[PDB]
Each structure stands twice: as C-alpha cells, then as structure tokens.
C-alpha cells in the first residue's frame, strides 16, 4: 500500500546499479538515507532515479512502499529535490547507527523472518552449481549465508569483508542462516 507521508532525507550511501533475478532480469540499486532523527534502507527499483540519489542534494521521497523495516521506491514513487529552506545536517550518531552491524551470536537469537544488512568477514566459501554458501564469522560466532542469483558466485577470498544488503534471517531445523532473496546484494567492503 502506497505510503503517503513524504520523507525529507539526506542520502548517506548507494550501491551502483545491479542486475537481479525476479520470479526475468531487472536492474535496481540499494540506498541508505537519513533524516535528522533516523536512518532508512531503501530499495530503489527505478534506476532512472540514480542522479537524485547521488547525494549532492537533500531529496523528498513520496508514494513509497514500507515493509521489512525499509522503503521501496519504484516506478509509481515520486522523488524530488528539496527546496532551499528544507536543508539540514544529520547527526554523527545517526550516520554511525546506519552503519552498525549486529554481532553473529545476537543474530542467532533474532526472530526468524527479520531482514539483515551488515559487514561480515568471510571464513569459508562453497561454490555449487546454482547456490553459494558463504560462511561468515566474527569474534562471537559464525553463520551460513545462502546466495542464489546475483548473490551466487561473487568473487571473494577468505579474509575479505562482505557487505550484505537485504538478506532474510531464516530458522529451519533448529538452525539460523541468512538467505538471499530477489533484492539482496553482496559486495566486498
């Protein structure tokens, strides 16, 4: 359901556009945005909005979808440059928070179905025909990451830090793992 209330945000980061696999091939990019008081992850499904998300100006986003604790900006959304008098600076506390990664022991206790973003060091990688199993690790634990589609077979080595966008935390058979989904993305940090 289209969210009405426009958000006036500073764009803190974006990915480059990337190709994803639908249940057909389309292009999107990920973005992180902030007000003076909070941060949001944004799935930008309309790549023609790339320039508005370059982060040189403050923007106003309306007609977006909101679910999974994030915003979806698509072809039905409207994105505009904020007027002269609507400029603000976002506090360092919020920029820092937007970049926080949960510890893996904490993730192991998190509710099934939650979306996860973060930076995790790669321990081990198993490349199969269709799917890749990335074993990520920190001082507190390890977890399997299951990548299919654009998250299958990303070049990386042991020691590399992996930046994950939009993964699904899944508990099945007494074990928790991150599963890539349609809009997920991995890059080396």
Spell out the domains of the chain, with CATH numbers in brackets. Answer: 1-100 (2.40.50.140), 101-189 (2.40.50.140)
* Sequence-ordered list of residues with C-beta below 8 angstroms from that of 186, at least 6 positions apart, any chain: 134, 147, 151, 154, 162, 163, 164, 165, 180
Resolution of this entry in Å?
2.0
| Token duo for residue 98 | 């937007």
Structure tokens at 189: 């940090």
Do 169 and 176 contact (CB within 8 A), yes or no?
yes
DSSP string spanning the chain?
Answer: --B-S-EEEEEEEEPPPEEEE---EEEEEEEEEE-SS-EEEEEE--GGGTGGGSSSS-EEEESBEEETTEEEE-TT-EEEEPPGGG-----HHHHHHHT----HHHHTTSPTT-EEEEEEEEEEEEE-SSEEEEEEEETTEEEEEEEEGGGSS----TT-EEEEEEEEEEEETTEEEEE--TT-EEEE-
Chain breaks in the chain (C to N over 2.5 A) after: 23
Instruction: Please choose, from the candidates 78, 67, 79, the residue with its C-alpha nearest in 3D space to the C-alpha of residue 40.
Output: 67
- Which experimental method was this entry solved with? X-ray
Rg (CA), the chain: 17
Q: Which two tokens stand for residue 107?
A: 């993730």
């Amino acid at each position: 359901v289209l969210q009405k209330r426009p958000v006036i945000v500073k764009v803190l980061s974006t990915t480059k556009p990337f190709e994803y696999e639908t249940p057909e091939k389309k292009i999107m990019f990920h973005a992180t945005v902030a007000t003076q008081t909070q941060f949001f992850h944004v799935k930008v499904l309309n790549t023609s909005l790339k320039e508005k998300f370059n982060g040189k100006k403050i923007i106003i986003i309306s007609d977006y979808l909101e679910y999974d604790s994030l915003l979806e900006v698509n072809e039905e959304s409207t994105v505009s440059e904020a007027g002269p008098n609507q400029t603000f600076e976002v506090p360092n506390k919020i920029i820092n928070r937007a970049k926080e990664t949960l510890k893996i022991d904490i993730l192991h206790k998190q509710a099934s179905g939650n979306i996860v973003y973060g930076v995790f060091m790669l321990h081990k990688k198993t490349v199969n025909q269709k799917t890749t199993i990335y074993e990520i690790q920190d001082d507190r634990g390890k977890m399997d990451v299951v990548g299919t589609g654009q998250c299958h077979n990303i070049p990386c080595e042991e020691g590399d830090k992996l930046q994950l966008f939009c993964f699904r935390l899944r508990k099945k058979n007494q074990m928790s793992k991150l599963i890539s989904e349609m809009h997920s993305f991995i890059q080396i940090k």
